[PDB]
Design a protein around this ligand. Structure first.
Ligand SMILES: N#Cc1ccc(OCCCN2CCC([C@@](N)(c3ccccc3)C3CCCC3)CC2)cc1
Length: 469
């Protein structure tokens, strides 16, 4: 409307007043996405973008929020004439969804830095005519809710967003761009991407949000960063409290990434009486296993990151091996570059740094060292095996000689007497089975006291020949 009942908590004078508003909306039949996004974007603007004059909390007066809300709903209702797009069965048409998408797109500034912070919310859309890629998808869903189109929902993979709609919520439509320089497929289905088994579309095991999950998304989308060195404590607390609210109401049940986000917040500043970060990372993984066929990568990356920051090398390696065990059953496609970057950084920067420190600490006489644990060597091998298996049958390759130099270095961090204790068994303490042909052929090389660097490089890159002189 806004409806009279939506107005009664205003003004919002504190973090807890914002939480109250969210609790009230979440108790309603259809929480108002437009209201909630505007409120979050307003408070984020005045806590992270411009803190001038801040003394405690940027008071959100009804007149201010109602005027932004009226700006949004006038823009959408004025531009989308529903009479041109008749709705059979309380469900929307592809042409209507494309029209809403066009309205949002055409409203945006012609040129801006697309990966700025703080351009995720409808506050950014209205005040700066700027949205990020997923922010466009969210805005389309909000616009559709404003129009009364109850069937249009947000769909999320781990790196992209689109919408579902239509009979049984079975249709898909692209509504935003992905990446940089990829020509957009706005208006089309996601079926080609599902069919090619790319990570971008998760083999169809992507999130189909309900209205509560869309609230969770906008909460995850809060960006407390003020600058490279500085987060808003007020926004961290708000996001954390809102995520707990959502958790308590059941709305994180099917949202792995949100559980990882909450775990990270709890690591930073734990809430008394709440589960530990580790419990929450494991709940994220459980969510992915239960609802998404264990086809998500980030539940395991979140866990690995926590173990890495806490120098639990064994457990970090195990979680990265688990990441690779998920990726192995995908085809590496155009538009999957973000996950390639994640794996590249782990293999070629993070793991080497962790193992270098471990080596120094072993020299200093550490006991229980990951470098003396054959199960840790097995996790490292399983990580590479999943990456190599991922590469098999993909339309673009993954491995190259850059990766091989780091593999050889990482292998060398383990003494031969440790490496010799892993039992590599064939289909048909530690025991490991390799799924990739690359690692099966490398087995022979993985225990020599002196790693044959040149042979390992040849096997990992499948390089046919060596230099002529
Ligand atoms: N080791 C390790 C490691 C740990 C965590 C890690 O990434 C955790 C952050 C994952 N990232 C995924 C995309 C995600 C997001 N960019 C996203 C999520 C789904 C669909 C599109 C975009 C946002 C979610 C709320 C606003 C947009 C932001 C969080 C990477 C490596």
């Amino acid at each position: 409307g806004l409806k009279a009942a939506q107005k009664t908590l205003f003004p919002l004078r504190s973090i807890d007043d914002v939480v109250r508003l969210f609790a009230a909306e979440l108790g309603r039949e259809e929480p108002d996405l437009v209201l909630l996004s505007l409120v979050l974007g307003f408070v984020e603007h005045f806590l992270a973008v411009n803190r001038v004059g801040l003394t405690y909390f940027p008071v959100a007066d009804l007149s201010i929020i109602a005027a932004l809300y009226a700006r949004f709903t006038a823009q959408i209702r004025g531009a989308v004439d529903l009479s041109l797009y008749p709705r059979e069965g309380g469900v929307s048409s592809r042409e209507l969804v494309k029209k809403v998408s066009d309205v949002i797109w055409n409203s945006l500034s012609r040129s801006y830095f697309k990966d700025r912070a703080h351009i995720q919310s409808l506050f950014s859309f209205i005040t700066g005519t700027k949205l990020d890629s997923s922010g466009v998808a969210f805005a389309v869903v909000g616009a559709c809710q404003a129009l009364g189109l109850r069937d249009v929902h947000l769909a999320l993979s781990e790196d992209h967003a689109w919408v579902v709609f239509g009979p049984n919520g079975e249709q898909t439509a692209e509504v935003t761009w992905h990446g940089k320089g990829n020509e957009d497929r706005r208006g089309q289905t996601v079926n080609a991407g599902v069919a090619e088994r790319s990570w971008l579309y998760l083999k169809g095991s992507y999130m189909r949000c309900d209205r509560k999950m869309e609230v969770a998304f906008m909460v995850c989308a809060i960006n407390p960063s003020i600058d490279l060195h500085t987060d808003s404590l007020e926004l961290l607390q708000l996001q954390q409290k809102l995520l707990w609210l959502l958790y308590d109401l059941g709305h994180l049940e099917r949202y792995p990434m949100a559980l990882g986000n909450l775990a990270d917040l709890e690591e930073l500043e734990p809430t008394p009486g709440r589960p530990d970060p580790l419990t929450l990372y494991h709940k994220g993984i459980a969510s992915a296993k239960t609802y998404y066929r264990d086809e998500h990568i980030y539940p395991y990356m979140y866990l690995a990151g926590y173990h890495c920051r806490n120098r639990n090398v064994r457990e970090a390696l195990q979680a990265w091996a688990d990441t690779a065990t998920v990726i192995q059953d995908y085809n590496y496609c155009r538009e999957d570059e973000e996950i390639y970057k994640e794996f590249f950084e782990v293999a070629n920067d993070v793991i080497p740094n962790l193992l270098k420190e471990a080596a120094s600490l072993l020299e200093a006489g550490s006991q229980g060292s990951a470098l003396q644990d054959p199960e840790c060597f097995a996790h490292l091998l399983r990580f590479y095996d999943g990456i190599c298996k991922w590469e098999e049958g993909s339309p673009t390759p993954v491995l190259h000689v850059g990766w091989a130099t780091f593999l050889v270095q990482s292998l060398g961090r383990f003494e031969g007497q440790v490496r010799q204790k892993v039992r590599i068994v064939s289909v048909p303490g530690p025991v490991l089975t390799f799924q990739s042909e690359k690692m099966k052929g490398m087995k022979e090389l993985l225990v020599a006291t002196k790693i044959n660097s040149s042979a390992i490089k040849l096997q990992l890159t499948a390089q046919s020949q060596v230099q002529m002189k």
